[PDB]
Amino acid sequence: YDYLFKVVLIGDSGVGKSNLLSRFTRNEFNLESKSTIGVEFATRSIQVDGKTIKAQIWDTAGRAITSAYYRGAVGALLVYDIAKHLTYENVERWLKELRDHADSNIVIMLVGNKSDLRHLRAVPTDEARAFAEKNGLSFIETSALDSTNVEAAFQTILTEIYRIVSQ
Amino acid sequence: SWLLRLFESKLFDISMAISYLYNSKEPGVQAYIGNRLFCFRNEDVDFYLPQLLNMYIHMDEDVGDAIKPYIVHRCRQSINFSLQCALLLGAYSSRGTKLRKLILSRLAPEREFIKSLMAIGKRLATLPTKEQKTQRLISELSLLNHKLPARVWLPTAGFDHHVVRVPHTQAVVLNSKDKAPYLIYVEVLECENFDTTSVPARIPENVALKEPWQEKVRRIREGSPYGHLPNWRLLSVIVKCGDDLRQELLAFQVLKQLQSIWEQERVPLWIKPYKILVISADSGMIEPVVNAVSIHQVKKQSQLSLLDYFLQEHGSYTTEAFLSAQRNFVQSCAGYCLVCYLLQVKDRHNGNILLDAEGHIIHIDFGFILSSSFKLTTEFVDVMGGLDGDMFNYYKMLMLQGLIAARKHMDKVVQIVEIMQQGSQLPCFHGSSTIRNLKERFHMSMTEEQLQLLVEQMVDGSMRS
Ligand SMILES: COc1ccc(-c2c(C)nc3c(NCCNC(C)=O)cc(Cl)nn23)cc1S(=O)(=O)NCCO
Numbered sequence: 146y147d148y149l150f151k152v153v154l155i156g157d158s159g160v161g162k163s164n165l166l167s168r169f170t171r172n173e174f175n176l177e178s179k180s181t182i183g184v185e186f187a188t189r190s191i192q193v194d195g196k197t198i199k200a201q202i203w204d205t206a207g208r209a210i211t212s213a214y215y216r217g218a219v220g221a222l223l224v225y226d227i228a229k230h231l232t233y234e235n236v237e238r239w240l241k242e243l244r245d246h247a248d249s250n251i252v253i254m255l256v257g258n259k260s261d262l263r264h265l266r267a268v269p270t271d272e273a274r275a276f277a278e279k280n281g282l283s284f285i286e287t288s289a290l291d292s293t294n295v296e297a298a299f300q301t302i303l304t305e306i307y308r309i310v311s312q
Numbered sequence: 313s314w315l316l317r318l319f320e321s322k323l324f325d326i327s328m329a330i331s332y333l334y335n336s337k338e339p340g341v342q343a344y345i346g347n348r349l350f351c352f353r354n355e356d357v358d359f360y361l362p363q364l365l366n367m368y369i370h371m372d373e374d375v376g377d378a379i380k381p382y383i384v385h386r387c388r389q390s391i392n393f394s395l396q397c398a399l400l401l402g403a404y405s406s407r408g409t410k411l412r413k414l415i416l417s418r419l420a421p422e423r424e425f426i427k428s429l430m431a432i433g434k435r436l437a438t439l440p441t442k443e444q445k446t447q448r449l450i451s452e453l454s455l456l457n458h459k460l461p462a463r464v465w466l467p468t469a470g471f472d473h474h475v476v477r478v479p480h481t482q483a484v485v486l487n488s489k490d491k492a493p494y495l496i497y498v499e500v501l502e503c504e505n506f507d508t509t510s511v512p513a514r515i516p517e518n519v520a521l522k523e524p525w526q527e528k529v530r531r532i533r534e535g536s537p538y539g540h541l542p543n544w545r546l547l548s549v550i551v552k553c554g555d556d557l558r559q560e561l562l563a564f565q566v567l568k569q570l571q572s573i574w575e576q577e578r579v580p581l582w583i584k585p586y587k588i589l590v591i592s593a594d595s596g597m598i599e600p601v602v603n604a605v606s607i608h609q610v611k612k613q614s615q616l617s618l619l620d621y622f623l624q625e626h627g628s629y630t631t632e633a634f635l636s637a638q639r640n641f642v643q644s645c646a647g648y649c650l651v652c653y654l655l656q657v658k659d660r661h662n663g664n665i666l667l668d669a670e671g672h673i674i675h676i677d678f679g680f681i682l683s684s685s686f687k688l689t690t691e692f693v694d695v696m697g698g699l700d701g702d703m704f705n706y707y708k709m710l711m712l713q714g715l716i717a718a719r720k721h722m723d724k725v726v727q728i729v730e731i732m733q734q735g736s737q738l739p740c741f742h743g744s745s746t747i748r749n750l751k752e753r754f755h756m757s758m759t760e761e762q763l764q765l766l767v768e769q770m771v772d773g774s775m776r777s
């Protein structure tokens with residue numbers, strides 16, 4: 146276990162932070178859900194550029210005062226539900242969030258989740274990626290249900306982090 | 313994964329979808345199903361349009377929001393669909409309003425076509441006799457043919473089409489009541505798709521009696537400008553300008569399912585759902601059954617007893633036409649007995665039962681059902697060959713067979729009714745335990761020996777008068 150990366154999951158309640166974590170970390174999904182009370186913890190290790198990184202993932206909530214866990218995190222997945230525009234709208238307030246309670250030099254991925262709900266899409270991929278590169282966020286769309294881009298999501302942010310090699 | 317497991321199984325149908333959609337409090341599920349609607353066949357989902365639209369109105373926003381996308385999608389690809397949506401949206405709210413206005417926003421021709429039909433009916437109110445009403449109608453219908461063909465269709469038609477002509481001379485008013493309903497014949501040219509095809513060109517125009525349906529088409533067709541085209545077909549609707557049809561629709565759905573249930577199982581009961589079109593909570597149209605007339609008027613024109621009429625019209629007890637008619641009699645009776653029983657249909661009389669040319673009976677006035685507050689008269693038993701008769705015994709056998717069948721698919725029926733009760737001001741839901749009483753009437757707990765006895769008891773009740 147060469148390294149230890151602390152990563153947080155943030156987003157509005159219901160967008161799928163908690164199911165993203167269970168897919169990525171234990172390859173499990175559930176339609177039925179329990180609101181996350183405070184924080185939930187799960188962990189998984191990967192290799193990038195020949196190196197073993199164990200990642201520690203914190204599943205927070207939309208119980209507003211979870212802000213504490215943000216500190217000392219190298220990466221944060223900020224998640225919105227592609228099918229509920231309101232959840233995408235608060236992403237501006239969610240990036241305002243990290244710019245109040247979290248490292249100003251933290252790796253963020255914007256994540257559109259529930260890409261399987263093709264017919265209910267309320268946030269166009271173009272509009273999102275536009276805000277993505279309008280800002281300093283990396284971007285991807287996932288489905289926790291079918292598992293699309295779920296590995297990709299993690300592997301992107303973990304690769305991005307290791308790219309912080311200090312000389 | 314255990315839930316999603318089911319939803320991804322073959323077991324998943326539009327029926328089930330709605331149930332979970334109706335019951336589940338998990339918004340992730342509601343939203344999941346909202347999406348899955350698109351994969352189902354338009355036809356299957358269509359049957360449940362009143363439910364979906366009802367829920368949209370009366371349920372949590374979460375529930376609505378999952379449904380809306382699909383609706384709009386269908387609305388965008390079918391104005392028929394659009395129409396039917398719009399009409400239902402309106403009838404069932406007196407949330408909804410927001411969506412109706414959006415849909416109507418194009419459909420003006422049809423809405424004026426429909427307004428006019430309704431308007432016609434309201435005028436006949438000043439004419440106190442059936443016959444007087446009839447004459448105003450025919451005249452005023454003649455006025456319709458102006459704008460002869462137009463971008464309007466009968467939603468109640470099994471198919472897509474354009475209305476070209478109204479053979480006004482053939483139309484009739486059905487009773488002498490204040491806001492009497494009225495029957496009309498309509499000429500149409502069939503489409504492959506309504507939404508994409510030019511309205512046909514006018515063809516310049518230049519007698520009504522009691523006759524079978526195929527004979528009336530001949531007469532109307534031969535007289536019609538458009539009658540030469542292969543494209544030409546004749547439709548019919550009853551227009552009720554002042555009668556609520558939401559119960560009428562509900563019974564339809566219930567009838568239609570039961571019809572399926574007995575078809576799926578192999579129970580040769582017979583029933584006939586007649587299509588319903590809700591226009592307002594006030595008003596509607598009905599697609600009428602052809603080649604059939606009320607028993608009561610069948611007894612006033614024949615001067616016969618029911619059995620005798622059978623004998624006159626089909627033949628002696630040794631004829632095929634009769635035994636066939638007798639079987640169809642018996643089967644339509646058991647069917648309609650069960651329907652009356654399950655739905656607790658009341659106000660049952662020979663004015664509300666039709667007889668078709670093949671021998672089936674057909675019940676019609678589905679006011680007085682369920683919580684709102686069938687007769688085996690000896691005249692009926694006679695047609696069956698009498699109480700000791702084999703054909704009568706078979707009637708008892710069909711009722712049990714169909715009751716047993718009914719239990720095996722109870723939830724699909726109850727679903728239909730139970731969803732509809734939502735936020736409902738229908739008189740049939742007046743009770744506290746409307747749905748609960750309905751389920752009890754399925755006797756899910758009973759053994760078949762108990763049910764045999766219950767069927768026997770049922771028949772006995774129907775005879776007392
Ligand atoms: C109570 O609701 C109804 C239910 C069914 C029918 C109906 C159907 C499906 N088919 C027919 C029908 N057959 C006509 C077919 N044409 C032919 C034989 O050529 C005649 C009549 Cl009166 N009604 N009817 C009519 C009414 S009603 O509103 O007009 N009341 C009715 C109270 O009387």
Ligand SMILES: Nc1nc2c(ncn2[C@@H]2O[C@H](COP(=O)(O)OP(=O)(O)OP(O)(O)=S)[C@@H](O)[C@H]2O)c(=O)[nH]1
Nearest residue numbers: 159160161162163164176178181207259289290340
């Ligand atoms: N179609 C589809 N539904 C999803 C997806 N992800 C989650 N859902 C649904 O979101 C709902 C709950 O999401 P969940 O991830 O547990 O909460 P959260 O996003 O972490 O937020 P919280 O309530 O705990 S504070 C579940 O019903 C779940 O099935 C997805 O990727 N596709």
